[PDB]
Design an enzyme around this catalytic site. Sequence first.
Site, PDB file in Angstrom:
ATOM      1  N   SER A   1      35.078  13.737  -1.395  1.00  0.00           N
ATOM      2  CA  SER A   1      34.637  12.622  -0.556  1.00  0.00           C
ATOM      3  C   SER A   1      34.079  13.128   0.771  1.00  0.00           C
ATOM      4  O   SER A   1      34.704  13.937   1.476  1.00  0.00           O
ATOM      5  CB  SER A   1      35.698  11.507  -0.368  1.00  0.00           C
ATOM      6  OG  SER A   1      37.086  11.959  -0.404  1.00  0.00           O
TER       7      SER A   1
ATOM      8  N   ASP B   1      33.046   2.911   6.168  1.00  0.00           N
ATOM      9  CA  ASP B   1      34.007   3.975   5.861  1.00  0.00           C
ATOM     10  C   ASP B   1      33.438   5.323   6.305  1.00  0.00           C
ATOM     11  O   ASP B   1      33.572   6.337   5.616  1.00  0.00           O
ATOM     12  CB  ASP B   1      34.390   3.973   4.373  1.00  0.00           C
ATOM     13  CG  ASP B   1      35.412   5.038   4.029  1.00  0.00           C
ATOM     14  OD1 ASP B   1      36.357   5.256   4.834  1.00  0.00           O
ATOM     15  OD2 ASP B   1      35.252   5.654   2.949  1.00  0.00           O
TER      16      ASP B   1
ATOM     17  N   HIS C   1      38.012   7.150   5.802  1.00  0.00           N
ATOM     18  CA  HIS C   1      39.288   7.094   5.102  1.00  0.00           C
ATOM     19  C   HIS C   1      39.944   8.463   4.993  1.00  0.00           C
ATOM     20  O   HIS C   1      41.104   8.573   4.602  1.00  0.00           O
ATOM     21  CB  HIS C   1      39.160   6.410   3.738  1.00  0.00           C
ATOM     22  CG  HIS C   1      38.621   7.277   2.640  1.00  0.00           C
ATOM     23  ND1 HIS C   1      37.364   7.089   2.095  1.00  0.00           N
ATOM     24  CD2 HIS C   1      39.188   8.288   1.934  1.00  0.00           C
ATOM     25  CE1 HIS C   1      37.170   7.963   1.122  1.00  0.00           C
ATOM     26  NE2 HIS C   1      38.258   8.707   1.009  1.00  0.00           N
TER      27      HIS C   1
ATOM     28  N   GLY D   1      38.771  15.249  -3.151  1.00  0.00           N
ATOM     29  CA  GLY D   1      38.478  16.235  -2.113  1.00  0.00           C
ATOM     30  C   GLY D   1      36.995  16.490  -1.938  1.00  0.00           C
ATOM     31  O   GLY D   1      36.585  17.292  -1.105  1.00  0.00           O
TER      32      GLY D   1
HETATM   33  B1  C8D Z   1      38.470  11.697  -0.861  1.00  0.00           B
HETATM   34  O1  C8D Z   1      39.533  11.514  -0.071  1.00  0.00           O
HETATM   35  O2  C8D Z   1      38.560  13.205  -1.099  1.00  0.00           O
HETATM   36  C1  C8D Z   1      38.339  10.961  -2.268  1.00  0.00           C
HETATM   37  C2  C8D Z   1      37.254  11.687  -3.122  1.00  0.00           C
HETATM   38  C3  C8D Z   1      36.892  10.839  -4.371  1.00  0.00           C
HETATM   39  O3  C8D Z   1      37.913  11.019  -5.348  1.00  0.00           O
HETATM   40  N1  C8D Z   1      38.108   9.517  -2.108  1.00  0.00           N
HETATM   41  C4  C8D Z   1      38.703   8.609  -2.933  1.00  0.00           C
HETATM   42  O4  C8D Z   1      39.449   8.891  -3.856  1.00  0.00           O
HETATM   43  C5  C8D Z   1      38.392   7.132  -2.659  1.00  0.00           C
HETATM   44  C6  C8D Z   1      39.241   6.719  -1.455  1.00  0.00           C
HETATM   45  C7  C8D Z   1      39.645   5.254  -1.756  1.00  0.00           C
HETATM   46  O5  C8D Z   1      38.544   4.377  -1.670  1.00  0.00           O
HETATM   47  C8  C8D Z   1      38.319   3.780  -0.430  1.00  0.00           C
HETATM   48  C9  C8D Z   1      37.111   3.040  -0.245  1.00  0.00           C
HETATM   49  C10 C8D Z   1      36.204   2.853  -1.316  1.00  0.00           C
HETATM   50  C11 C8D Z   1      35.030   2.121  -1.085  1.00  0.00           C
HETATM   51  C12 C8D Z   1      34.734   1.584   0.185  1.00  0.00           C
HETATM   52  C13 C8D Z   1      35.623   1.762   1.254  1.00  0.00           C
HETATM   53  C14 C8D Z   1      36.813   2.488   1.035  1.00  0.00           C
HETATM   54  C15 C8D Z   1      37.720   2.682   2.097  1.00  0.00           C
HETATM   55  C16 C8D Z   1      38.894   3.414   1.848  1.00  0.00           C
HETATM   56  N2  C8D Z   1      39.185   3.942   0.625  1.00  0.00           N
HETATM   57  C17 C8D Z   1      39.939   5.318  -3.249  1.00  0.00           C
HETATM   58  N3  C8D Z   1      38.860   6.193  -3.699  1.00  0.00           N
HETATM   59  C18 C8D Z   1      38.323   6.108  -4.950  1.00  0.00           C
HETATM   60  O6  C8D Z   1      37.411   6.845  -5.328  1.00  0.00           O
HETATM   61  C19 C8D Z   1      38.955   4.989  -5.859  1.00  0.00           C
HETATM   62  N4  C8D Z   1      37.822   4.306  -6.513  1.00  0.00           N
HETATM   63  C20 C8D Z   1      37.518   3.031  -6.152  1.00  0.00           C
HETATM   64  O7  C8D Z   1      38.124   2.425  -5.322  1.00  0.00           O
HETATM   65  O8  C8D Z   1      36.463   2.516  -6.799  1.00  0.00           O
HETATM   66  C21 C8D Z   1      35.904   1.224  -6.499  1.00  0.00           C
HETATM   67  C22 C8D Z   1      35.442   1.090  -5.034  1.00  0.00           C
HETATM   68  C23 C8D Z   1      33.907   1.169  -5.007  1.00  0.00           C
HETATM   69  C24 C8D Z   1      33.467   1.444  -6.445  1.00  0.00           C
HETATM   70  C25 C8D Z   1      34.646   1.042  -7.337  1.00  0.00           C
HETATM   71  C26 C8D Z   1      40.102   5.426  -6.853  1.00  0.00           C
HETATM   72  C27 C8D Z   1      40.920   6.687  -6.475  1.00  0.00           C
HETATM   73  C28 C8D Z   1      41.069   4.221  -6.996  1.00  0.00           C
HETATM   74  C29 C8D Z   1      39.535   5.724  -8.240  1.00  0.00           C
END
Ligand code: C8D
EC number: 3.4.22.-
Lengths: 153, 180, 16, 21
Positions: free
Chosen positions: B139, B81, B57, B137
């Site tokens: 992730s 992912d 992602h 950031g």
């Molecule tokens: B990264 O880009 O730097 C960032 C670092 C963490 O803050 N990633 C995120 O913010 C992720 C990215 C999105 O989630 C996903 C995802 C999640 C699970 C499986 C597959 C995928 C594919 C694509 N994007 C949003 N995100 C989050 O952390 C979100 N949390 C969330 O979705 O939580 C549920 C999903 C599994 C557990 C609960 C947010 C930002 C909405 C809090």
Amino acid sequence: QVEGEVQIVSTATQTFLATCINGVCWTVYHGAGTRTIASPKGPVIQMYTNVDQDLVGWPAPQGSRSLTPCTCGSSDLYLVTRHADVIPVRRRGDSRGSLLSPRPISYLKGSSGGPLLCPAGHAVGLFRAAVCTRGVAKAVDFIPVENLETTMR
Amino acid sequence: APITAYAQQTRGLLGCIITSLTGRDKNQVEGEVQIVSTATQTFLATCINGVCWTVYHGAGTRTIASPKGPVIQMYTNVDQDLVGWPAPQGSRSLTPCTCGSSDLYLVTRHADVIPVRRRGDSRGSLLSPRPISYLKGSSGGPLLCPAGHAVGLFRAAVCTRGVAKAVDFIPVENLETTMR
Amino acid sequence: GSVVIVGRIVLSGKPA
Amino acid sequence: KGSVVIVGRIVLSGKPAIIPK
Ligand SMILES: *[B]([O])([O-])[C]([C][C][O])[N]C(=O)[C]1[C][C](OC2=C3[C]=[C][C]=[C]C3=[C][C]=N2)[C]N1C(=O)[C]([N]C(=O)O[C]1[C][C][C][C]1)C([C])([C])[C]
Ligand SMILES: *[B]([O])([O-])[C]([C][C][O])[N]C(=O)[C]1[C][C](OC2=C3[C]=[C][C]=[C]C3=[C][C]=N2)[C]N1C(=O)[C]([N]C(=O)O[C]1[C][C][C][C]1)C([C])([C])[C]
Ligand SMILES: [Mg+2]
Ligand SMILES: [Mg+2]
Ligand SMILES: [Zn+2]
Ligand SMILES: [Zn+2]
């Protein structure tokens, strides 16, 4: 501009360690007494004194960064010497830990006020004294960290 | 152990763009975790077993800029992912955890080590909650066992009102699956 | 008497 | 579309050290 968590400090007599935790530069009473710590603007007075716990703290000096208190509660600890050696240590009680490998006492001289860190490298306690049979340090006494947080309050 | 980390910026916003476009990158590489940027966003990439992994992602299907120009992903698994390139010359790989411990430690883009308790395959809870923005950031960064071995890569945060209390992550197992 | 600083230790081992 | 780029690093393998003078 690299910053250290652990300062190597000296009186006229001894030479020992201090550790920054939560903005405060702690060390041992038996080393520091009630002395001020030097700064280039002049002496800075102790912010905390606790003669009971062998614990003194000043405001953390320049070129320093603080540790965070350990919150994982692990029992696997690591002592850091004043030669930046790392010694694995297994937590017994609150303030007792035993060296997974015991060694000469000379190997920990100048190290009281050094830290004990958990797996995460977070702060578990300051090191106070060595449990030991003749020649050889075998376990350690340390000021636990909750003592610091409740000296702060 | 003890796990301690530091961070080094190696590039500026300007130089990042030029390098993104040319795909040619002559900077030398060190360490186990790389801080990486697309044009849109920035995140982490972790080297395990000679492969440089990161979240899909974040990377989508992009090449990575290398000394020899752009490099195609070796592995892609949209559903995990998850994404992989051959570890850059000069990086160091982590090894997968095999003690199977449940006390994890997450490495942060700010080079912090924060303790996590495992609560299932791909889910663990923070011992002290944090603002969700603190984790943005991070992730693609690793979770480690007390030994410093890779248990998983950080995928997403579990939160409400902007406070994260648990983390969701890709377990090391899934990597092996993705190789096969 | 005044407590003095003779050296520092960085735990992460971060270089210059 | 543009290449992913390394802009920094995190180093775990470092061990405690006396800051050189
Ligand atoms: B990264 O880009 O730097 C960032 C670092 C963490 O803050 N990633 C995120 O913010 C992720 C990215 C999105 O989630 C996903 C995802 C999640 C699970 C499986 C597959 C995928 C594919 C694509 N994007 C949003 N995100 C989050 O952390 C979100 N949390 C969330 O979705 O939580 C549920 C999903 C599994 C557990 C609960 C947010 C930002 C909405 C809090
Ligand atoms: B340090 O200043 O450089 C130094 C490093 C160790 O080599 N510390 C010492 O020498 C300490 C100081 C003394 O002990 C204490 C003490 C101990 C416990 C609670 C409060 C206080 C307050 C003041 N001083 C002697 N010492 C030791 O390490 C000794 N070990 C010892 O006493 O062991 C017992 C202490 C509690 C449990 C075991 C010696 C010198 C014999 C190693
Ligand atoms: Mg390290
Ligand atoms: Mg760090
Ligand atoms: Zn801890
Ligand atoms: Zn393990």
